[PDB]
């Protein structure tokens, strides 16, 4: 659960 604008996610 990372922000929509973040270039990289977590899973």
């Amino acid at each position, epitope marked *: *659960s*990372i*922000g*929509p*604008g973040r*270039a*990289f996610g977590g899973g």
Partner: antibody, heavy 126, light 112 residues
């Protein structure tokens, strides 16, 4: 436990490159989500510079554009910061921080920069 | 870019009193019912310390006299009762998108 530490020059002449090192102790750089470089200008104004994802991929603040470069060294457990063509308006305190998964709520997660280094002052002047 | 505007730049409060700092994003920072707004406190000669993340969740080791609320574009940090060791600068930071941006900060000067 976990500890981050910056090191590098106190003085850099204009038009030169600036190389800073963030040494991470008691935690592996491959174990975290992201590793940031943030700077504070005299006046306490903060500016986020960029970060290197655990997958080695990166993202930088557009303002810094083409002058910034962040790399790492898994064997020594350190991530670096290189800034090209520095000027006096690049004098500031640099901090390297860790972004990590904060277990919150009913068994869920949220990413926050929770552990910062002491910071290292860098002055750009002739 | 998301501009976080904090008000006021500084405020004076007597210990025991209530202090309330606001922070406003130029755009909504919600997503999947979670506000990507965090708060840091920084005392002179030290690195910023995390206080609250996700608009209202407190960090470990942070006393409950610290509260944070809001959603969308308007968020506020509340201290009550204001103790002597709260004099510092408080910044709000959004993790909604890259680049991550901060607020200008709010100096909390204690009244005596």
């Amino acid at each position: 436990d976990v500890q981050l530490q910056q090191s590098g020059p106190d003085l850099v002449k204009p038009s030169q490159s600036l190389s800073l090192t963030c040494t991470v102790t008691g935690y592996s750089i491959t174990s975290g989500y992201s590793w940031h470089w943030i700077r504070q200008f005299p006046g306490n104004k903060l500016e986020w510079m960029g970060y290197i994802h655990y997958s080695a991929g990166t993202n930088y603040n557009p303002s810094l554009k083409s002058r910034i470069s962040i790399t790492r060294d898994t064997s020594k457990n350190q991530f670096f910061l290189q800034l090209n063509s520095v000027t006096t308006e690049d004098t500031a305190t640099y901090y390297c921080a860790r972004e990590e998964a904060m277990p919150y709520g009913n068994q869920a997660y949220y990413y926050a920069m929770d552990c910062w280094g002491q910071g290292t002052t860098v002055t750009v002047s002739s | 870019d998301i501009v976080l505007t904090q008000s006021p730049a500084s405020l004076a409060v007597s210990l025991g009193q209530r202090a309330t700092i606001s922070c406003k994003a130029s755009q909504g920072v919600d997503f999947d019912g979670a506000s990507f707004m965090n708060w840091y406190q920084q005392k002179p000669g030290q690195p910023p310390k995390l206080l609250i993340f996700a608009a209202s969740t407190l960090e470990s080791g942070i006393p409950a006299r610290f509260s944070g609320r809001g959603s969308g574009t308007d968020f506020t940090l509340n201290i009550h009762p204001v103790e002597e060791e709260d004099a510092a600068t408080y910044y709000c930071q959004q993790s909604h998108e890259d680049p991550l941006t901060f607020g200008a900060g709010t100096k909390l000067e204690l009244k005596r």
